[PDB]
Amino acid sequence: AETKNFTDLVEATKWGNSLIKSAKYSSKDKMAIYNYTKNSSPINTPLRSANGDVNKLSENIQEQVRQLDSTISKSVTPDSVYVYRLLNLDYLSSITGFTREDLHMLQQTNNGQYNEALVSKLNNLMNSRIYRENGYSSTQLVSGAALAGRPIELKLELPKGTKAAYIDSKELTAYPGQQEVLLPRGTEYAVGSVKLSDNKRKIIITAVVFKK
């Protein structure tokens, strides 16, 4: 079936609400998602340190991880869909072969426009590679909704039927209006390409997420 891609806030909300409807969230579900949106670091950092091994976490964080895992599992995407994640350049600081000086030169833009050869290097260094996030992954259906512009847009194709929570409702997120979709911890994506935007003022990394 077709992949969905949203630019209209009203249509993204309509689509997203269909996931919320299907999940039948409990009061605990709501609390877990809201608290995550407020303050993700007490969960994110340990999960990364533990390389995803919940049995290494503190008791309070283990309970929170079992909870958020369960909450997200309550809905799956009803269509294949793209979601977006706007990132600062330090996202690239762990890309093998992309050196600190590459990064330094990258951020030395020409009036906001990025160096095409360096973006070409990035494509050469990231294409066909799988990257994994051991924490949860925060993404949005509408790129830049309620957010300031950033140098990098991670454009992620989610398979139909993969676990995903749409959380842009006022009792679920401390940051309404972002059209946020929350993905399971341990999300993996395989990068297809790294290209410059319209503008050359944005770097777009297009990737495909493995179904979970």
Side-chain angles (χ1 to χ4, degrees), residues 1-23 25-84 86-93 95-115 117-199 201-212:
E2 296 73 47
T3 296
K4 308 276 289 159
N5 188 246
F6 293 98
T7 58
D8 180 88
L9 288 175
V10 169
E11 296 288 351
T13 286
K14 182 178 161 203
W15 187 88
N17 281 163
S18 77
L19 278 69
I20 290 173
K21 182 164 179 186
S22 73
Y25 288 141
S26 71
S27 299
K28 251 263 166 208
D29 287 323
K30 293 199 246 174
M31 174 193 124
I33 296 162
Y34 192 90
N35 285 338
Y36 185 83
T37 68
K38 298 177 83 183
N39 197 22
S40 63
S41 70
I43 287 161
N44 176 345
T45 296
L47 269 173
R48 287 176 168 167
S49 292
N51 193 25
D53 177 13
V54 68
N55 290 351
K56 287 192 179 72
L57 308 187
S58 219
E59 297 290 356
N60 66 309
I61 301 306
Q62 291 189 215
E63 170 168 355
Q64 284 171 42
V65 167
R66 281 183 292 271
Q67 174 59 243
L68 198 54
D69 287 356
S70 165
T71 298
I72 295 171
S73 80
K74 286 183 180 184
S75 48
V76 298
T77 55
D79 306 278
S80 163
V81 56
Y82 279 101
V83 294
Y84 297 87
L86 288 186
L87 300 159
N88 290 311
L89 290 181
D90 56 28
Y91 166 80
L92 303 173
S93 83
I95 303 305
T96 297
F98 200 74
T99 73
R100 170 71 182 95
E101 194 69 2
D102 293 332
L103 193 54
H104 171 70
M105 296 183 289
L106 188 59
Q107 60 85 227
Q108 291 189 314
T109 66
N110 185 154
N111 197 35
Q113 284 188 331
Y114 296 102
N115 190 106
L118 285 166
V119 178
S120 281
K121 184 167 190 184
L122 272 176
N123 178 80
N124 169 269
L125 298 176
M126 305 182 62
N127 85 86
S128 305
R129 307 196 150 237
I130 299 158
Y131 297 92
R132 183 196 179 92
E133 165 59 58
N134 283 316
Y136 295 91
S137 294
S138 302
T139 71
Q140 57 190 342
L141 279 175
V142 181
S143 179
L147 291 168
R150 275 168 150 198
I152 292 170
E153 179 189 273
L154 182 57
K155 169 177 177 186
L156 299 179
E157 192 195 333
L158 304 184
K160 177 183 182 163
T162 201
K163 290 180 182 54
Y166 175 79
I167 68 174
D168 200 3
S169 188
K170 301 256 156 150
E171 83 280 11
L172 301 182
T173 181
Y175 290 84
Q178 297 180 345
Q179 292 292 163
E180 185 167 353
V181 169
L182 193 60
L183 309 177
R185 64 189 182 97
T187 286
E188 301 170 290
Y189 52 95
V191 172
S193 65
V194 184
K195 304 183 173 306
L196 279 166
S197 56
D198 225 336
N199 7 343
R201 299 200 160 77
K202 195 166 83 184
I203 303 164
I204 304 189
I205 306 166
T206 301
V208 183
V209 165
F210 283 0
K211 186 164 206 209
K212 283 174 83 56

Coordinates of all heavy atoms in Angstrom, one line a residue, residues 18-26 29 32-33 64-78 136 161-167 181-185 187 211-212, unseen atoms left out:
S18 N -5.9 8.1 15.2 CA -6.3 6.7 14.9 C -5.4 5.7 15.7 O -5.9 4.7 16.1 CB -6.5 6.4 13.4 OG -5.2 6.1 12.9
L19 N -4.1 6.1 15.8 CA -3.3 5.2 16.6 C -3.7 5.3 18.1 O -3.8 4.3 18.8 CB -1.8 5.5 16.5 CG -1.1 4.9 15.3 CD1 -1.6 5.6 14.0 CD2 0.4 5.0 15.4
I20 N -4.0 6.5 18.5 CA -4.3 6.6 19.9 C -5.6 5.9 20.3 O -5.7 5.1 21.2 CB -4.5 8.1 20.3 CG1 -3.1 8.9 20.3 CG2 -5.2 8.2 21.7 CD1 -3.2 10.4 20.5
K21 N -6.6 6.0 19.4 CA -7.8 5.3 19.5 C -7.6 3.8 19.7 O -8.2 3.1 20.6 CB -8.8 5.5 18.3 CG -10.1 4.8 18.5 CD -11.1 5.4 17.5 CE -12.4 4.6 17.6 NZ -13.4 5.0 16.6
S22 N -6.7 3.3 18.9 CA -6.5 1.8 18.9 C -5.8 1.4 20.2 O -5.9 0.2 20.6 CB -5.7 1.4 17.7 OG -4.4 1.8 17.8
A23 N -5.0 2.3 20.8 CA -4.2 1.8 21.9 C -5.0 1.7 23.2 O -4.6 0.9 24.1 CB -3.1 2.8 22.1
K24 N -6.1 2.4 23.4 CA -7.0 2.3 24.6 C -6.1 2.6 25.8 O -6.1 1.8 26.8 CB -7.6 1.0 24.8 CG -8.5 0.5 23.7 CD -9.0 -1.0 23.9
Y25 N -5.4 3.7 25.9 CA -4.5 4.0 26.9 C -5.2 4.0 28.3 O -6.3 4.6 28.4 CB -3.8 5.3 26.7 CG -2.8 5.4 25.6 CD1 -2.7 6.5 24.8 CD2 -1.9 4.3 25.4 CE1 -1.8 6.6 23.8 CE2 -1.0 4.4 24.3 CZ -1.0 5.5 23.5 OH -0.1 5.6 22.5
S26 N -4.5 3.4 29.3 CA -4.9 3.5 30.7 C -4.3 4.8 31.3 O -3.5 5.5 30.7 CB -4.3 2.3 31.4 OG -2.9 2.4 31.5
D29 N -0.6 4.5 31.3 CA 0.0 4.7 30.0 C 0.2 6.2 29.8 O 1.2 6.8 29.4 CB -1.0 4.2 28.9 CG -1.0 2.7 28.8 OD1 0.1 2.1 28.9 OD2 -2.1 2.2 28.5
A32 N 3.1 7.6 31.9 CA 4.4 7.2 31.4 C 4.8 8.0 30.3 O 5.9 8.5 30.2 CB 4.4 5.7 31.0
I33 N 3.9 8.2 29.3 CA 4.3 9.0 28.1 C 4.6 10.4 28.5 O 5.6 11.0 28.1 CB 3.2 8.9 27.0 CG1 3.0 7.5 26.5 CG2 3.5 9.9 25.9 CD1 1.6 7.4 25.7
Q64 N 9.8 1.8 35.0 CA 9.5 2.8 33.9 C 9.7 2.3 32.5 O 8.8 2.6 31.7 CB 10.3 4.1 34.2 CG 9.6 4.8 35.4 CD 10.5 6.0 35.8 OE1 11.1 6.7 35.0 NE2 10.7 6.2 37.1
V65 N 10.8 1.6 32.3 CA 11.0 1.0 31.0 C 10.0 -0.1 30.7 O 9.5 -0.1 29.6 CB 12.5 0.4 30.9 CG1 12.6 -0.5 29.7 CG2 13.4 1.6 30.9
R66 N 9.7 -1.1 31.6 CA 8.7 -2.0 31.3 C 7.4 -1.3 30.9 O 6.6 -1.7 30.0 CB 8.5 -3.0 32.5 CG 9.5 -4.1 32.5 CD 9.3 -5.0 33.6 NE 9.5 -4.5 35.0 CZ 10.6 -4.5 35.6 NH1 11.7 -5.0 35.0 NH2 10.7 -4.0 36.8
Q67 N 7.0 -0.3 31.7 CA 5.8 0.5 31.4 C 5.8 1.1 30.0 O 4.9 0.9 29.3 CB 5.6 1.5 32.5 CG 4.4 2.5 32.3 CD 3.1 1.8 32.1 OE1 2.4 1.9 31.1 NE2 2.6 1.2 33.2
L68 N 6.9 1.9 29.7 CA 6.8 2.6 28.4 C 6.9 1.6 27.2 O 6.3 1.8 26.2 CB 8.0 3.6 28.3 CG 7.9 4.7 27.3 CD1 6.5 5.5 27.4 CD2 9.0 5.7 27.3
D69 N 7.6 0.5 27.4 CA 7.6 -0.5 26.4 C 6.2 -1.1 26.2 O 5.8 -1.2 25.0 CB 8.5 -1.7 26.8 CG 10.0 -1.5 26.8 OD1 10.5 -0.4 26.4 OD2 10.7 -2.5 27.2
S70 N 5.5 -1.3 27.3 CA 4.1 -1.8 27.1 C 3.2 -0.8 26.5 O 2.5 -1.1 25.5 CB 3.6 -2.2 28.5 OG 2.2 -2.4 28.5
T71 N 3.3 0.5 26.9 CA 2.5 1.5 26.3 C 2.7 1.6 24.8 O 1.7 1.7 24.0 CB 2.9 2.9 27.0 OG1 2.5 2.7 28.4 CG2 2.1 4.0 26.4
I72 N 4.0 1.7 24.4 CA 4.2 1.8 22.9 C 3.7 0.6 22.1 O 3.2 0.8 21.0 CB 5.7 2.1 22.7 CG1 6.2 3.4 23.4 CG2 6.2 2.0 21.3 CD1 7.8 3.5 23.4
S73 N 3.8 -0.5 22.7 CA 3.3 -1.8 22.1 C 1.8 -1.8 21.8 O 1.4 -2.7 21.1 CB 3.8 -3.0 22.9 OG 2.9 -3.2 24.0
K74 N 1.1 -0.9 22.5 CA -0.4 -0.9 22.4 C -0.9 -0.4 21.0 O -2.1 -0.5 20.7 CB -1.0 -0.1 23.5 CG -0.9 -0.9 24.8 CD -1.7 -0.2 25.9 CE -1.6 -1.0 27.2 NZ -2.4 -0.4 28.3
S75 N 0.0 0.2 20.2 CA -0.4 0.6 18.9 C 0.7 0.3 17.9 O 1.9 0.4 18.1 CB -0.8 2.1 18.8 OG 0.2 3.0 19.4
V76 N 0.2 0.0 16.7 CA 1.1 -0.2 15.5 C 0.7 0.7 14.4 O -0.5 1.2 14.4 CB 1.1 -1.6 15.0 CG1 1.6 -2.6 16.1 CG2 -0.3 -2.1 14.5
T77 N 1.6 1.0 13.5 CA 1.2 1.9 12.4 C 0.2 1.3 11.5 O 0.4 0.2 11.0 CB 2.5 2.3 11.6 OG1 3.1 1.1 11.2 CG2 3.5 3.1 12.5
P78 N -0.9 2.0 11.2 CA -1.9 1.4 10.3 C -1.5 1.6 8.8 O -2.1 1.0 8.0 CB -3.1 2.3 10.6 CG -2.5 3.6 10.9 CD -1.3 3.3 11.7
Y136 N 14.8 5.2 23.8 CA 13.6 5.4 23.0 C 13.9 6.4 21.8 O 14.9 7.1 21.9 CB 12.4 5.8 23.8 CG 12.0 4.8 24.8 CD1 12.6 4.8 26.0 CD2 11.1 3.7 24.5 CE1 12.3 3.8 27.0 CE2 10.8 2.8 25.4 CZ 11.4 2.8 26.7 OH 11.1 1.8 27.6
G161 N 2.5 -1.7 10.4 CA 2.4 -2.6 11.4 C 3.5 -2.7 12.4 O 3.6 -3.6 13.3
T162 N 4.4 -1.7 12.4 CA 5.5 -1.6 13.4 C 5.0 -0.9 14.7 O 4.1 -0.1 14.6 CB 6.7 -1.0 12.8 OG1 7.9 -1.3 13.6 CG2 6.6 0.5 12.8
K163 N 5.6 -1.2 15.8 CA 5.1 -0.6 17.1 C 5.4 0.9 17.0 O 6.5 1.3 16.7 CB 5.8 -1.2 18.3 CG 5.4 -2.6 18.6 CD 6.1 -3.2 19.8 CE 5.7 -4.6 20.1 NZ 5.9 -5.5 18.9
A164 N 4.5 1.7 17.4 CA 4.7 3.2 17.4 C 3.6 3.9 18.2 O 2.4 3.5 18.0 CB 4.7 3.7 16.0
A165 N 3.9 4.8 19.0 CA 2.9 5.6 19.7 C 2.7 7.0 19.2 O 3.7 7.7 19.1 CB 3.2 5.7 21.2
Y166 N 1.5 7.4 18.8 CA 1.3 8.8 18.5 C 0.9 9.5 19.8 O -0.1 9.1 20.4 CB 0.2 9.0 17.5 CG -0.1 10.5 17.2 CD1 0.7 11.2 16.3 CD2 -1.2 11.1 17.7 CE1 0.4 12.5 16.0 CE2 -1.6 12.4 17.4 CZ -0.8 13.1 16.6 OH -1.1 14.4 16.3
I167 N 1.7 10.5 20.1 CA 1.5 11.1 21.5 C 1.1 12.6 21.5 O 1.2 13.2 22.5 CB 2.7 10.8 22.3 CG1 3.9 11.6 21.9 CG2 3.0 9.3 22.4 CD1 5.1 11.5 22.9
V181 N 5.7 11.1 17.4 CA 5.5 9.7 17.4 C 6.7 9.1 18.2 O 7.8 9.4 17.9 CB 5.6 9.1 15.9 CG1 5.7 7.6 15.9 CG2 4.3 9.6 15.2
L182 N 6.4 8.3 19.2 CA 7.4 7.7 20.0 C 7.7 6.3 19.6 O 6.7 5.5 19.5 CB 6.9 7.7 21.5 CG 8.0 7.4 22.6 CD1 9.1 8.4 22.5 CD2 7.3 7.4 23.9
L183 N 8.9 5.9 19.2 CA 9.3 4.5 18.8 C 9.9 3.7 19.9 O 10.6 4.3 20.8 CB 10.2 4.6 17.6 CG 9.8 5.5 16.4 CD1 10.8 5.6 15.3 CD2 8.4 5.0 15.9
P184 N 9.8 2.4 19.9 CA 10.4 1.5 20.9 C 11.9 1.7 21.0 O 12.6 2.1 20.1 CB 10.2 0.1 20.2 CG 9.1 0.3 19.3 CD 9.1 1.7 18.8
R185 N 12.3 1.4 22.2 CA 13.8 1.4 22.5 C 14.4 0.3 21.6 O 13.8 -0.7 21.3 CB 14.1 1.1 24.0 CG 13.6 -0.2 24.5 CD 13.7 -0.2 26.0 NE 13.3 -1.5 26.6 CZ 14.2 -2.4 26.9 NH1 15.5 -2.3 26.7 NH2 13.8 -3.6 27.5
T187 N 15.4 0.8 18.5 CA 15.0 1.0 17.1 C 16.3 1.0 16.2 O 17.3 1.6 16.6 CB 14.3 2.4 16.9 OG1 12.9 2.2 17.4 CG2 14.1 2.8 15.5
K211 N 11.1 -3.4 11.2 CA 9.9 -3.6 12.0 C 10.2 -4.2 13.4 O 11.0 -5.1 13.5 CB 8.9 -4.5 11.2 CG 7.5 -4.7 11.8 CD 6.7 -5.2 10.7 CE 5.2 -5.0 10.8 NZ 4.5 -6.1 10.1
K212 N 9.4 -3.6 14.4 CA 9.5 -4.2 15.7 C 8.0 -4.5 16.2 O 7.9 -5.4 17.0 CB 10.1 -3.3 16.7 CG 11.7 -3.3 16.6 CD 12.3 -2.3 17.5 CE 12.5 -2.8 18.9 NZ 13.2 -4.1 19.1

